[PDB]
Design a protein around this ligand. Sequence first.
Ligand SMILES: Nc1ncnc2c1ncn2[C@@H]1O[C@H](COP(=O)(O)OP(=O)(O)OC[C@H]2O[C@@H](O)[C@H](O)[C@@H]2O)[C@@H](O)[C@H]1O
Ligand SMILES: Nc1ncnc2c1ncn2[C@@H]1O[C@H](COP(=O)(O)OP(=O)(O)OC[C@H]2O[C@@H](O)[C@H](O)[C@@H]2O)[C@@H](O)[C@H]1O
Ligand SMILES: Nc1ncnc2c1ncn2[C@@H]1O[C@H](COP(=O)(O)OP(=O)(O)OC[C@H]2O[C@@H](O)[C@H](O)[C@@H]2O)[C@@H](O)[C@H]1O
Ligand SMILES: Nc1ncnc2c1ncn2[C@@H]1O[C@H](COP(=O)(O)OP(=O)(O)OC[C@H]2O[C@@H](O)[C@H](O)[C@@H]2O)[C@@H](O)[C@H]1O
Ligand SMILES: O=C([O-])CC(=O)C(=O)O
Ligand SMILES: O=C([O-])CC(=O)C(=O)O
Ligand SMILES: O=C([O-])CC(=O)C(=O)O
Ligand SMILES: O=C([O-])CC(=O)C(=O)O
Ligand SMILES: [Ca+2]
Ligand SMILES: [Ca+2]
Ligand SMILES: [Ca+2]
Ligand SMILES: [Ca+2]
Ligand SMILES: [Ca+2]
Ligand SMILES: [Ca+2]
Ligand SMILES: [Ca+2]
Ligand SMILES: [Ca+2]
Lengths: 318, 318, 318, 318
Amino acid sequence: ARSKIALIGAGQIGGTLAHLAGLKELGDVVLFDIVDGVPQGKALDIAESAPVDGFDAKYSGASDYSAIAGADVVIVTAGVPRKPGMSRDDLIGINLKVMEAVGAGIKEHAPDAFVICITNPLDAMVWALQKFSGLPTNKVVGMAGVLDSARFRHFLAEEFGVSVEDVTAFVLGGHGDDMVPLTRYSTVAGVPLTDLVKLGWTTQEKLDAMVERTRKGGGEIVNLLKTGSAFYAPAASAIAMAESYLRDKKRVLPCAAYLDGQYGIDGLYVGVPVVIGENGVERVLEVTFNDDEKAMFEKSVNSVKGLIEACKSVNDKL
Amino acid sequence: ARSKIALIGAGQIGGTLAHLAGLKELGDVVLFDIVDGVPQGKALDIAESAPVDGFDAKYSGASDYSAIAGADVVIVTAGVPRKPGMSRDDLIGINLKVMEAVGAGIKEHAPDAFVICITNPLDAMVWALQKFSGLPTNKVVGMAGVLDSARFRHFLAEEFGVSVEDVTAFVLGGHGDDMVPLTRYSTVAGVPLTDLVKLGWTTQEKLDAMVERTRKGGGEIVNLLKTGSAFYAPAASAIAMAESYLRDKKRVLPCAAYLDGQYGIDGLYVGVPVVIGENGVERVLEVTFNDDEKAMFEKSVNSVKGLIEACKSVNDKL
Amino acid sequence: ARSKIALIGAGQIGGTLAHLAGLKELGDVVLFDIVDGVPQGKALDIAESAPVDGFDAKYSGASDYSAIAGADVVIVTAGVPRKPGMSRDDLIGINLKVMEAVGAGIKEHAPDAFVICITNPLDAMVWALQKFSGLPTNKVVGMAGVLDSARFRHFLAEEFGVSVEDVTAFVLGGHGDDMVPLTRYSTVAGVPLTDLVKLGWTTQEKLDAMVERTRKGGGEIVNLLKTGSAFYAPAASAIAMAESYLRDKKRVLPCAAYLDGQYGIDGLYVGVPVVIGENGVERVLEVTFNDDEKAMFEKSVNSVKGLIEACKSVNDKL
Amino acid sequence: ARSKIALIGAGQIGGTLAHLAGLKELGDVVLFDIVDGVPQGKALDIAESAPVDGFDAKYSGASDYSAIAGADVVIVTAGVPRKPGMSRDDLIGINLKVMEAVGAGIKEHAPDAFVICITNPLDAMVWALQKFSGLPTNKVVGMAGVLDSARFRHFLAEEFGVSVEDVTAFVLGGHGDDMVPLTRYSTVAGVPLTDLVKLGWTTQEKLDAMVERTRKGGGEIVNLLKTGSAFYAPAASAIAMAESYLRDKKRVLPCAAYLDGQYGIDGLYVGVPVVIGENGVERVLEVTFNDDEKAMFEKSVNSVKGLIEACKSVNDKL
Ligand SMILES: Nc1ncnc2c1ncn2[C@@H]1O[C@H](COP(=O)(O)OP(=O)(O)OC[C@H]2O[C@@H](O)[C@H](O)[C@@H]2O)[C@@H](O)[C@H]1O
Ligand SMILES: Nc1ncnc2c1ncn2[C@@H]1O[C@H](COP(=O)(O)OP(=O)(O)OC[C@H]2O[C@@H](O)[C@H](O)[C@@H]2O)[C@@H](O)[C@H]1O
Ligand SMILES: Nc1ncnc2c1ncn2[C@@H]1O[C@H](COP(=O)(O)OP(=O)(O)OC[C@H]2O[C@@H](O)[C@H](O)[C@@H]2O)[C@@H](O)[C@H]1O
Ligand SMILES: Nc1ncnc2c1ncn2[C@@H]1O[C@H](COP(=O)(O)OP(=O)(O)OC[C@H]2O[C@@H](O)[C@H](O)[C@@H]2O)[C@@H](O)[C@H]1O
Ligand SMILES: O=C([O-])CC(=O)C(=O)O
Ligand SMILES: O=C([O-])CC(=O)C(=O)O
Ligand SMILES: O=C([O-])CC(=O)C(=O)O
Ligand SMILES: O=C([O-])CC(=O)C(=O)O
Ligand SMILES: [Ca+2]
Ligand SMILES: [Ca+2]
Ligand SMILES: [Ca+2]
Ligand SMILES: [Ca+2]
Ligand SMILES: [Ca+2]
Ligand SMILES: [Ca+2]
Ligand SMILES: [Ca+2]
Ligand SMILES: [Ca+2]
């Protein structure tokens, strides 16, 4: 009767997800990977940490999909990350094929799961995984905007010298160079950033620099680490989406969600604000854009369509 | 070397403060009261709960002010609460005299404390306590707006069917019938309430009703309980202010703060958004009002001045 | 789909239970009482605190038993507490009649609940409540030994100057003057207290005094407070039992449990170590006593039988 | 005024330490490493995660020791880990030289720190680091026994089907093949394992197998992962030691501590139960052994002396 969380991919993000699921006592955890030994190892290491922190959760590792049977939530990091110099879209060839296998494992063994996709390029990969798996669209989502928004919140907290708890950010669109941070709908304690520029708490130029740093955030971390990409903030972000589902919190979070008409878009995953509860993606919050925001969003969406055509370009079934 | 928190008043709020200080592992706790036995009892009861939850904190009870020596934070609930039918301003006669004694105990034994006043009527009582005690104005604050704002957040979370974590409220002014909730600076995930009315997520009339329910919130709880007033949400609210100080979080919180020129006011405590860190009230966020907000705020402040004149009206020293 | 916790009695312990259930995010809460207004008030006050701490839980108050429908856990504090000068057994007359009504409300509206009884005198009241309600015996338990054990742990932590996290206590029998703390099965970091006396970390006489202080602990708190009895540690204790059920933790806790043969006893509730998980009381840990421990336990059990005969003495159905 | 934690080594354990220090809100964090980019990257990634979980902590990365200035706690993982086939003692050549540099950085820039050493082989490395650094012996400790004990607790929790919170383990000696788990001082809820065998809750043979699995635990994880050694449980373990210091918890934990006469040993670090508070290692709990335990402990200590002679064998200063 505890919730069961299956982690497909037991790498950098996958391990961090497992550790956090325990610390937050979200349920039992299964780590799945094709490299044998790795998920069993990480599973046992985290299990062995549990008595120090006092959390009760069962941990196991597997390389067979039957291990995921009946999972309440499935989080997918399987595939490859970027190296310095690469865009996320350079990962499609390898990663699309991974989503195909993963999707078949979910369809067969955890068809009632809430599935959170992280593998990049995210808006394309999650669209793919939903098709391959055949799960209902409200039960399949992509983690991106919560990460982007959390980066922006960090930079803003630093700039204004305030608690991260009292900063809000709204970032929509692709998880891409062209994602759209909405300065008008980002706040300190409810006061929009555009108002804070007026009050002199910051400048326009500093605000623009933070928007740009947000757009380039993933790359900034790749360039520092060199051997891989970010994993702490991606993991935290997906975990918040998972907790909202498992605890029916109805968090409002920017996630790559399937649109049927919202924002005038039909049939794609795109980053938008969504309510997440026990029924999955329960509602999309459709804001009214001004002309500049609308332009940036249309462009972001065009990139996503570009990527989706590239996925079809290379795979029969899609 | 652990932080020491002194709780002046060991009643309904006082006990709840103590319990929360332990659960959040904020430090050692001293409960102070004039009714002997009560603070010792509550102290020992909470101490005895600690092994169940795993928090290490020393707890003691006293009716001598020397017990508070060297406290890092002092939270004052001493005095009397309302009964059904009373306004908060009916409490001045009794409560002003309490602040006089409390202020003298702080001045003598915990002069370097960060002091959070809760005793009502709050904007008057905290102004009094700061004068009686002589502590620097940035080290003395009133808990009110965080409570008011949290009520509004609850009502809003209910209305929109979203997580309390993703709702923001901005309530300024007196802790009074005329406090000012700013619908324009209250949000769901960064989207102002005024925009949500437009989007049809709620109505103007429902929004107005929630503003009113917020203004009358304290009374609503008095009328239900009958034997006393609210204590869980007041306690939680003060504890968040205390934690921001002790952990240097720089939370942005609406609190009754001493103004020297901000909002065009000099020499009063009034509810405004303030940054709280290791140096106390570190900054006041002065927003730009429209004409209606400015009118409501001027009125709220006039009530506060009314009450302050009533305190002088009845006490030589002030 | 969140768990639902019904709190029967919305007094001192009842309110504290509600507050803790939220803070630990255990589920939705219903407070039930016969004094109208009180459970609605406390419910709304805690609901209003929630945005400060970030927990999502629905709170309501009621005086009709239909409100408890479908509760996963029910915690019963309804009845009356002691005043200075009284034993717990002086509460039977009033409290037995309360258990009768409560039992009928559970039988009708939450027959699949895990029920934790707190109302005193506890070993008698829980035996009663199980009969009146007709629920399976593994789904009905009494909170006592966790409280007694936590008091002992506090006193021990103080004595040895160590963390409460690293102290263990084993207290069996009645929740009464004659409860049995087992010094041999109480420890600091795994080292029995009897060994610590030998090592000189404490003395026999200090150890005996702490055993006695534990036996008299409830009274010590009554005498301090004067208007009522302990509520923080009782509430924490029951909450740990509830969490073990709801999260299937399989905590090993001393609770008043129904015995069918364990410890050579059949047909009574007595304080023993039990494993609590998703199926209720899952196992009883039956330790081997030495002659002194066996004598103390037989006596404790005789008191419990005394009290049960007194309950039959005054009620047809039992 | 927040506590400052310096992490010397920003690898697998180092990163995990940083993440946990934030989640537990222990203070500001500096990650230090010789590979440039790595500590800056991990620091920024964790900083960027913070708004998701609500913790306020400053994070930075450095490859200059001046960055550690004034740290309250320093945790050292710098050096190299094992690959499959190696013992921990095969790491001395490289790691001793690392401790020399680290020790000089601490001596110069954080001489008032509480220093927790993790780098293997641990009992030798921490003895070295204390000499190189010259800090007082009560301010320098090795993390090992908490890890070993937590592995044993996991295996035991599994075996008995009980919560990890209610299992205790006592493991002394070297962090080595010959560490000494004390079955007599390990417990479920206060009942020794030797008593549980008698009660039939487990068998002698299963107990012996779990003792052995504990002794080989590090290797078991190396063999699974292949590219490195355990990091989640080592990190959790050190963090508990750090928290006990920073919050003056007085946890009783088995750690590699400097002995002056305890256990009849003078001048070495060996794994023993110690009280950790604001003054560092405050007390050693010296238990009385039976003849078998004494034999195992003397042997464990002889290995440690072996390793210390090997360190002198290869370095002038020691
Ligand atoms: N077909 C597969 N099935 C299951 N697991 C797989 C498969 N192919 C690869 N894996 C595993 O997926 C894991 C990916 O882990 P990392 O390489 O450490 O990458 P991480 O940093 O965890 O990123 C994972 C994904 O998330 C995105 O942020 C990133 O761009 C990448 O696409 C590896 O352990 C790898 O063995
Ligand atoms: N001079 C005094 N010094 C110290 N303590 C005092 C004094 N006078 C009264 N007290 C104590 O102050 C405590 C107040 O507790 P409660 O009556 O339970 O009131 P509570 O609900 O805790 O409200 C406290 C205060 O906060 C406001 O919200 C409310 O309007 C009231 O002013 C009581 O225990 C009372 O003995
Ligand atoms: N028949 C009833 N049905 C429902 N609720 C009832 C009934 N009779 C009384 N109550 C309520 O039970 C509540 C008991 O609360 P408190 O009097 O504050 O007592 P508390 O300290 O909460 O103790 C409760 C119980 O637990 C034991 O520790 C103690 O000895 C007492 O038996 C009160 O709010 C009271 O209105
Ligand atoms: N002289 C040095 N100064 C600072 N950092 C160093 C130095 N030499 C190596 N490092 C860094 O120490 C870090 C060690 O990290 P990992 O190799 O990932 O090893 P980890 O699993 O973190 O183990 C660290 C240590 O703890 C023990 O458990 C283990 O046996 C090893 O000795 C690496 O990032 C490495 O760059
Ligand atoms: O950018 C990447 O390669 C990984 C990722 O999704 C992020 O860091 O934003
Ligand atoms: O209103 C009162 O009497 C107590 C209080 O400050 C509140 O509930 O808002
Ligand atoms: O003793 C009482 O009256 C209440 C109780 O159960 C305790 O404090 O032990
Ligand atoms: O064994 C190792 O190499 C690392 C370590 O200290 C452990 O896992 O016990
Ligand atoms: Ca726990
Ligand atoms: Ca539309
Ligand atoms: Ca703890
Ligand atoms: Ca101004
Ligand atoms: Ca939360
Ligand atoms: Ca038997
Ligand atoms: Ca927080
Ligand atoms: Ca000795």
